[PDB]
Design a protein around this ligand. Structure first.
Ligand SMILES: *C1O[C@@H]2[C@H](O)[C@@H](COP(=O)(O)OP(=O)(O)OC[C@H]3O[C@@H](n4cnc5c(N)ncnc54)[C@H](O)[C@@H]3O)O[C@@H]2S1
Ligand SMILES: [Zn+2]
Lengths: 289, 78, 112, 93, 107, 95, 83, 93, 105
DNA sequence: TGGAGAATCCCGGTGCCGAGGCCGCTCAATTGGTCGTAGACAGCTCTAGCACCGCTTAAACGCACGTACGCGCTGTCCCCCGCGTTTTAACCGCCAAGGGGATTACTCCCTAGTCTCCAGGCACGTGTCAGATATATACATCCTGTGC
DNA sequence: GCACAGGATGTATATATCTGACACGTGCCTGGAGACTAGGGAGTAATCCCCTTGGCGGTTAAAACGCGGGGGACAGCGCGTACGTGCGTTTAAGCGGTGCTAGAGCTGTCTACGACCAATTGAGCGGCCTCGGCACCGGGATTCTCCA
């Protein structure tokens, strides 16, 4: 649960700490999740966006909220943490999304969190776009290959993690040897080209994309659901805080992401798997009926 | 005829090297260093040519001069 | 005479074995040259060239091109430490230099 | 005139390792010069080694020692491995 | 920049120092020789004049000389820049070149 | 007592005028044997071999320190620091 | 028989003598570990080359000519031991 | 077996130039190694010169060119002059 | 006289030089004029270095020549130093010199 | 400016291990002669180095202005240096064992040297495809006008 | 003031056109492969003894540790100006033509010369002894340090 506030850079122009945690009335929230379910159950191209609110239930604090790491670092000095990425237990939402992908309803997923709990939950790596990155992944500096490890690499700013590449070329040549740099973007750093392109294509193709656990204040990550509804498509912004694009939001919720998703799956008749260790899987699992 | 190496040329060479600013007195020193290097390499090449009883300074002669001075040069055959 | 199967085919190399044998003999390296020296030398040269070419092709593919050029060889060399050591004294023509900018030279961001 | 070069063998190796990729003429010349230089270095070291031990011949052993002396790092290990495999296959034939 | 941006929150004369950085980025990604061929060829002719008169130079010979000298000077300037950085500076001066050569063994 | 620095020049003059082997012989031999243990086991160095190794190492270190002192003095200093050794080893192509 | 961490044998006064030979007037404290590392690297190189020569010669003793040949190879030709 | 060294002729030169000076065994060994190294340099450069031009004989011309390529200005001039004088006095008688 | 070295105005062994050239694996043929030249050059270089070393010895109040004298002779002469840049003379020491700023002021 | 000292240059006595000379001789340098060919010399040609021109125009050159840097001065502090006592281990002198280097025969297998045969590798001819430049087109973001 | 909407800036994609270098094809020839023999380079085993390893013991030279002070490393701040950047004027580099011929490369012929060999002898090396240069030790006189 190390914070990516001092790790990113001292420069932090958040300017957002007064965040009234608006909550919806139970009946209004029920109706809003009902209509969202009615839309999604028929919407074909569905791509989600998970922010640093899903893992708050896991135990790792969010960034902007009243308990946000940046918020506390701004007003006084009191960063409180409970859990660790290594011990980070997946939230029920990660398994919900895994099941949604399994049944094929969830066309794509573009998260911006950093704990990689989606990767650890078995979500096909070919379907995610860890735009900001993932601790449990170090990418080679020569062959641009990835290695989903089991223990955090332990570095920030796209720097060496102390391991050389171990991919063997043919013709008994020397194995490629690159730094296996880390994947977390510092302020003023470019995004992974492949992941960003896949996310853009998915979001554009998405006639209905719902963005969770994110304030969407951040670069591109919060802009994908703008282009999801531009050129058609409806946007569902499920978050507690007022998002930077509520005025453009085609839907809104004020409630717990876990609870709203649980109600959605209950209405759909859908169930949720129950976490695991680092049971990582890459190939897209076959769609289910 | 030495001044043919204009200040922009040395500036471009430095920019390739990695330099960010260039003191105004560098250019003369760089010209002198270039003259010394060319004098040595040309003397070796011309000796190689004169030995082979040739009036022309073949490219391979310059390549062998460089190889002798521990600056083996590729791409010119040899 | 039976079919003339060149030494390289038997050895399995791609470089010439007989050619290197003749180069060693006429190169004035020893009063006589073993029967296995050409094979070993050819294998070593083929492996070294294979390494350089493979790395250069990697650089080319990473540069969106299909014709290896001296720049690709320069990049394939200076970026691999062992080859840079072995080729420390060479100056591959038309190779340029690696894109190195010292950190102290870079500007200081976090303005505004 | 009759000029000698390793161009054909270098191209064969390239098409063996990179099924679809060309190589410029200047690049081919650079590769050929590299092969020539490495050959000269290894041969000279093998000759000096044969002279030090008062032997009058060059053999796989001397070439192996020259490769060990010259190439650094994993380069030497893998070059020695390839040379040994080549010579053992050739001797078996 | 199609939907791509760096990590952030959102939102004439160049400051002396940025145009030089752009120049560095430009010339360290190219490969063409960075000296005018005709004046350099005249220089090579003048230098070889002092040794043997009426000496004809192959075009490839002058090209090889130019490549060698360009590589040598680029390396020398790299080392001079390193020395200047070592001395808590950014502008390379003659003393930096002299020290670089002195350590290199040429001086 | 002597003001600090004055006997540094005295030691410089003395140890430059002389020609002996500065490092102690037995520890150097032990270091060399420990190093050689890495490559092949149970070697047997001729005394002349270790003498030559020590001569080479002493000459190399003396030259390296002369270069390092030049670097430090260029840096407007009188005390040679590790950064000076790194610079000298870098401008000479080592490492 | 298995020598350990003998690099410490190169003591502070010895390195100070070596530096004094080079014309140094003052020596920072951190210089000593750096110099020990540099000497260790140099000795690793020379001993590797000498052991290569010896093992090639089918001998088991590192004759002085082995070290002289290694130094000549590394561009550090040494006079006073033959060759 | 008996070994070969340049000690005797180094002694001859020393007495010729410094008729009242000796030389220690260490200095003799240093001179022997130096003479071996200089001879090796000159002869190797001569062999390279011969190989470059496809010649097959290391004639006095090869040696002269090698000594001009190796030694610096004044040293090279004096060495080449002495070599030419020696060859002239030899072939003449 | 009978010996080649004697017929030339040399003191070095011409026969040994020729034998080493022939057996040194340098070329298939070795000119009959090459040994004279090579021996003359070796003799000249030995004469030069020994002359400088003897001068150093005499200036050092020593009746002989010791490796230190050879080191001083080599390093104190620019041409020989350039010829002998990459050599180290065991027991030779280092040429005495100090920086221009570390001296007392 | 002057006065006491640690360290240094220098004079006299001298005896051991290393320089220097002696000498037998045994393998290497020398003389003379034979034979093949590697190179000296002469020719022919036609590749390509050289010289010159006119037009484009990319780059070089001169100046002007400002700020970013170099430089110098001043003030901690802290990090070496010098000295004196403890102590730690090199240094030397000698002795023993035995490995491993060095030389010696017997020999046997491998490489030099030939000759014959001929497919691999070159020089040239040809087709065309990758790469360079220019055009148009679709979509993100920035600047500005209008409406909330 | 923020947001909706349009104009503009800037980017990546599809496309077209062109050009000279690159891939494939072919005939031509000579350098490489197969079969062969002869002899000597260097395996291999045996033997000898030089030198490396190892140990011990005493004196004791240099390393180790501590302690104080003072020198400079390093940071900060302030002032001058030198370099970076921009612009407009110059100039000579680039390119493409021709037109010329020095001499680079190939060939042809022949002889001077290096390899080789046999037979001769002499000089440079291993072991022999003799003599002294300078390391070492005693003291007498001297030069920057430091202090005053
Ligand atoms: C570099 O990487 C970081 C990462 O990519 C994100 C982290 O923040 P975002 O995910 O962009 O926004 P976030 O602060 O998470 O906004 C979501 C809001 O949701 C609140 N929240 C907490 N727990 C929630 C549940 N269970 N349901 C709904 N909302 C919930 C958060 O407190 C926050 O207000 O960008 C940076 S930059
Ligand atoms: Zn890799």
């Amino acid at each position: 649960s190390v914070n990516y506030a001092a790790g990113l850079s001292p420069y932090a122009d958040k300017g957002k700490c007064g965040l009234p945690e608006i909550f919806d009335p139970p009946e209004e929230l029920e109706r809003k999740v009902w209509e969202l379910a009615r839309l999604v159950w028929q919407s074909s191209s569905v791509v989600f966006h998970t922010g640093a609110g899903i893992s708050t239930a896991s135990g790792i604090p969010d960034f902007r909220g009243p308990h946000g790491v940046w918020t506390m670092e701004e007003r006084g000095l009191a960063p409180k943490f409970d859990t660790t990425f290594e011990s980070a237990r997946p939230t029920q939402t990660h398994m919900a999304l895994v099941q949604l992908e399994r049944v094929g309803l969830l066309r794509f997923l573009v998260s911006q969190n950093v704990d990689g709990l989606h990767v650890r939950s078995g979500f096909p790596r070919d379907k995610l776009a860890e735009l900001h990155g993932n601790m449990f992944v170090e990418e080679c500096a020569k062959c641009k290959t990835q290695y989903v490890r089991d223990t955090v690499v332990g570095t920030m700013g796209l720097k060496a993690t102390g391991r050389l590449c171990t991919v063997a070329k043919a013709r008994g040549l020397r194995a490629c040897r690159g730094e296996l740099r880390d994947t977390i973007l510092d302020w003023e750093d470019s995004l992974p080209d492949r992941d960003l392109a896949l996310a853009d294509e998915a979001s554009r193709n998405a006639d209905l994309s719902i963005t969770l656990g994110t304030s969407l204040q951040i670069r591109p990550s919060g802009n994908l659901p703008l282009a999801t509804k531009r050129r058609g498509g409806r946007l569902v912004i499920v978050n507690l805080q007022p998002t930077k694009h509520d005025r453009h939001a085609d839907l809104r919720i004020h409630g717990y992401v876990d609870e709203v998703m649980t109600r959605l799956m209950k209405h759909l008749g859908l169930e949720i798997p129950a976490w695991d260790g680092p049971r990582v899987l890459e190939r897209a699992l076959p769609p289910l009926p | 005829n030495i001044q043919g190496i204009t200040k922009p040329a040395i500036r471009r060479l430095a920019r390739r090297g990695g330099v960010k600013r260039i003191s105004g007195l560098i250019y003369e020193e760089t010209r002198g260093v270039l003259k010394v290097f060319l004098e040595n390499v040309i003397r070796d090449a011309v000796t190689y040519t004169e030995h082979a009883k040739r009036k022309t300074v073949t490219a391979m002669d310059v390549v062998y001069a460089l190889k002798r001075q521990g600056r083996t040069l590729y791409g010119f055959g040899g | 005479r039976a079919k003339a199967k060149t030494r390289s085919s038997r050895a399995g190399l791609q470089f010439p074995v007989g050619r290197v044998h003749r180069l060693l003999r006429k190169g004035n390296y020893a009063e006589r040259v073993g029967a296995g020296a050409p094979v070993y030398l050819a294998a070593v040269l083929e492996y070294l060239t294979a390494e350089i070419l493979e790395l250069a092709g990697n650089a080319a593919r990473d540069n969106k091109k299909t014709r290896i050029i001296p720049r690709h060889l320069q990049l394939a060399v200076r970026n691999d430490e062992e080859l840079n050591k072995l080729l420390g004294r060479v100056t591959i023509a038309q190779g340029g230099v690696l894109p190195n900018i010292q950190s102290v030279l870079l500007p200081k961001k976090t303005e505004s | 005139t009759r000029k000698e070069s390793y161009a054909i063998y270098v191209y064969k190796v390239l098409k063996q390792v990179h099924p679809d990729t060309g190589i410029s003429s200047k690049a081919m010349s650079i590769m050929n010069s590299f092969v020539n230089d490495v050959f000269e270095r290894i041969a000279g070291e093998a000759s000096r080694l044969a002279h030090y031990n008062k032997r009058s011949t060059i053999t796989s052993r001397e070439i192996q020692t020259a490769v060990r002396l010259l190439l650094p790092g994993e380069l030497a290990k893998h070059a020695v491995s390839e040379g040994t495999k080549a010579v053992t296959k050739y001797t078996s034939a | 920049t199609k939907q791509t941006a760096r990590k952030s929150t959102g939102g004439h004369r160049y400051r002396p120092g940025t145009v030089a950085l752009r120049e560095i980025r430009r010339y360290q990604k190219s490969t063409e020789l960075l000296i005018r061929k005709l004046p350099f060829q005249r220089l090579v002719r003048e230098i070889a004049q002092d040794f043997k008169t009426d000496l004809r130079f192959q075009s490839s010979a002058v090209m090889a000389l130019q490549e060698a000298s360009e590589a040598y000077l680029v390396a020398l300037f790299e080392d001079t820049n390193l020395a200047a950085i070592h001395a808590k500076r950014v502008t390379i001066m003659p003393k930096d070149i002299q020290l670089a050569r002195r350590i290199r063994g040429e001086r």
